[PDB]
Amino acid sequence: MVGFGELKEEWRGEVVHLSWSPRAFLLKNFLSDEECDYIVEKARPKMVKRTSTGTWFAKGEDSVISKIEKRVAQVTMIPLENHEGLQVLHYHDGQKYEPHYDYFHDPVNAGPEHGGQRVVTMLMYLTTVEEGGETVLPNAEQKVTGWSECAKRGLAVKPIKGDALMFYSLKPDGSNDPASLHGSCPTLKGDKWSATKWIHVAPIGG
């Protein structure tokens, strides 16, 4: 798992530019329904108990997920050596994640072995959630209003199965973008499964 993998059959779906601050895109149908289900089924027997339950897949652990990992590498244009594995979270019944940052809220804390600061987060929605559950970004320039109360606190994205949210947590010059602060709104009914892909500015392992 270095570089970008084979060029077949690169993803060519709709890309919606959501926001300048932070820099965020929604990728429509980034994953197939099959892929979403595959991940949930593989994750489930491994889950342990923000309050929700989570598990990890090592980068490249699994050939189905590896294909997605290569997809991510190619759409972001950032080589796989800069990527962590796949973290899968499951939420239900009020469960959530208070708005937070992905970067060290002091940048001297991310060293060469971690690959420096996290630059891109790609949030992959593995289920469509039913009520609430929006990803919220409170510090965003523009807020939604047309949507749980929680969501009206920033820019929000609805978790629709197969969509992915992609956003930058560093500014172009490499400084922290406090606009990338983000949380998961209470999920109100019934199941939020998401997978997170974090990508670093430099390669991990050094």
Beta bridge partners of 184: 97, 135
- Smallest gap from Cβ 71 to Cl ion, in A, equals 20
What ranges make up the beta strands (E) of 34-83? Answer: 53-57
CB 123 to Cl ion: min, Å: 5
Residue 79 preceded by cis peptide, ω within 30:
no
- Residues that bind Cl ion (rule: CB under 5 A) add up to a total of 2
Residue 127 vs 184, nearer CB to Cl ion: 184
Reported as type and span, the H/E element at residue 120 is strand 118-125
Name the residue nearer to Cl ion (CB basis): 74 or 135.
Answer: 135
- Lookup result for tokens 């523009």: 142
For Cl ion, the closer CB: 148 or 184 = 184
Stretch that binds Cl ion, among 24-32, 78-86, 105-113, 134-142 (CB under 5 A): 134-142
Residue 160 CB, shortest distance to Cl ion, in Å, is: 13
* 11, HSE (Cβ side, Cα atoms, 13 Å): 23
**Measured from the CB atom, is 85 or 159 closer to Cl ion?**
159
Q: Pick from 184, 188, 198, 204 the residue near Cl ion by CB under 5 A.
A: 184
Ramachandran assignment for 163, one of left (phi > 0), alpha (psi -120 to 50 degrees), beta (any other): beta
The backbone torsions φ and ψ at residue 20, rounded to the nearest 5 degrees and listed phi first, read -95, -35
The residues pairing with 155 across neighbouring beta strands, listed in sequence order, are 137
Listed ranges 2-10, 83-91, 112-120, 181-189: which one lies at the site for Cl ion (CB under 5 A): 181-189
Q: Is 169 in the site for Cl ion (CB under 5 A)?
A: no
Sheet with 15-19, edge to edge strand ranges = 15-19, 24-27, 164-168, 118-125, 192-200, 86-91, 53-57
Q: What is d(CA 184, CA 100) in angstroms, rounded to the nearest whole number? A: 10
Candidate segments 73-81, 83-91, 110-118, 177-185, binder of Cl ion by CB under 5 A: 177-185
> Which among 21-29, 46-54, 130-138, 146-154 is the span making contact with Cl ion, rule CB under 5 A?
130-138
Binding of Cl ion by 176 (CB under 5 A): no
User: Of residues 121, 135, 148, 169, which one binds Cl ion by CB under 5 A?
Assistant: 135
- Which residues of this chain interact with Cl ion, rule CB under 5 A? 135, 184
